[PDB]
Design a protein around this ligand. Structure first.
Ligand code: GSH
Ligand code: GSH
Ligand code: GSH
Ligand code: GSH
Lengths: 221, 227
């Protein structure tokens, strides 16, 4: 198995992929991007990913494509990794099962709502050149609404003591949320206010593969 | 097959599912929600879908689940319908193939950036209680960015005259984008400024199943109101 090529940056979306690659025990190499310098909008990278954003992977083990499968969107990459590299179903469910589709539901809920909304909150709080309270308020509030939904989802998993989003194992859904959950403190939002999510977060943060994923790439150079 | 129950409203997201169901030739029954009355937040519906938004389906044909499979998120619902009801691959690619994954990448791109961003623009223009120019400008501009990307994507499918987002067939990625492309006119954004999208868009509206899905639930004087 050849190293997977990871185009990334030290961001919640990047962390999803680096964490899940560590969890699957996959070898990989990274190319690191400086977002503040608009490097993901450079021509050569947009040829790989039209959207011009990280993360993107190139898997040279995918034989049908010359030069390897190039894939973007954390939602798609996570699914691809699970389908291809977790056939033992340690972190995923068999295709076409209810638990498989519920995984999809909550993964897509994460990429379609959690990420975009918390991202807007981060923009109005940290990045925006002007202070716009309407926006700060709209996205902080909706961020809280969404984590309230995840708290509810966990509460529904009674038979496995609300330890996982779906059934009796972490799935790509958990790992996707994990990336952003890790950034909540930046908005002065204490994840412990949602008790089940607090336990779920603490559990994941104890796994060495999670701790390693959060280190890739470093916040440094 | 038994009818699939569709919880929906006349909205870009609802249309994604009603259009795809029509394309797949599946029997279904509709229950509409009045969003101005906060109906998707009622206790009974939040039990089915914790997020409290439409659309949501119930497939009584799914045999694993008592009472049928309940599924939310247009992205998951689309993937589910394609997996389950398009085994002939008329609107999807075989599981595991490069084209299958590119379909997934562009579908996720739609639900993760197109919908959320164009929805914010719609909020700042039609729904916000005050005029917030920073918001209006931010989301209109980013909406145009995203359609530009979809234009680039189409341009890379030269071998198929740039008619499809992936390969030689419409997939869930196209049908996903279509629901929201339909809403560009409200913002006075002419999709024809992206000429490949313009042809792609015009081609889809010629399909009888698309025209039908856009009438589900029906347009009327009770829902043709922008604010
Ligand atoms: N929906 C995408 C989000 C990707 C994304 O937001 N990437 C950010 C960093 S986390 C980025 O590349 N920003 C640079 C830019 O937008 O110019 C996904 O889930 O992968
Ligand atoms: N182009 C972005 C730059 C900042 C950015 O890329 N933020 C990422 C997170 S680092 C984001 O919000 N992603 C949203 C998502 O995951 O869908 C902006 O104008 O806000
Ligand atoms: N990520 C969701 C978005 C769903 C969505 O935005 N539904 C809207 C109608 S299009 C809704 O139910 N709004 C009611 C509310 O939020 O109160 C999906 O793609 O299914
Ligand atoms: N909860 C919304 C109500 C409006 C709404 O639900 N808009 C839908 C479309 S009708 C939306 O933007 N969905 C975002 C998406 O599809 O990801 C708000 O706060 O503005």
């Amino acid at each position: 198995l050849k190293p997977i090529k990871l185009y990334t940056a030290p961001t919640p979306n990047g962390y999803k992929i680096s964490i899940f690659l560590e969890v699957l025990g996959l070898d990989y190499e990274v190319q690191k991007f400086d977002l503040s310098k608009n490097e993901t909008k450079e021509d050569w990278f947009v040829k790989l990913n039209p959207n011009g954003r990280i993360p993107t992977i190139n898997d040279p083990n995918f034989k049908g494509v010359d030069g390897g499968l190039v894939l973007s969107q954390t939602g798609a990459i996570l699914q691809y990794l699970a389908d291809t590299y977790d056939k033992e179903h340690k972190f995923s469910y068999p295709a076409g099962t209810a638990e498989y589709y519920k995984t999809l539901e909550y993964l897509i809920f994460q990429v379609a709502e959690n990420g975009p909304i918390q991202g807007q909150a981060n923009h109005f709080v940290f990045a925006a050149k002007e202070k716009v309270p309407y926006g700060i308020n709209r996205y902080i509030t909706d961020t809280k609404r969404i984590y309230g939904v995840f708290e509810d989802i966990l509460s529904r998993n009674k038979a496995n003591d609300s330890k996982y989003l779906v059934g009796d194992r972490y799935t790509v859904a958990d790992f996707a949320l994990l990336g952003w959950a890790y950034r909540l403190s930046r908005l002065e939002i204490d994840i412990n206010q949602w008790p089940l999510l607090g336990k779920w977060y603490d559990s994941l943060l104890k796994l060495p593969a999670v701790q390693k994923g959060f280190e890739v790439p470093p916040k440094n150079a």
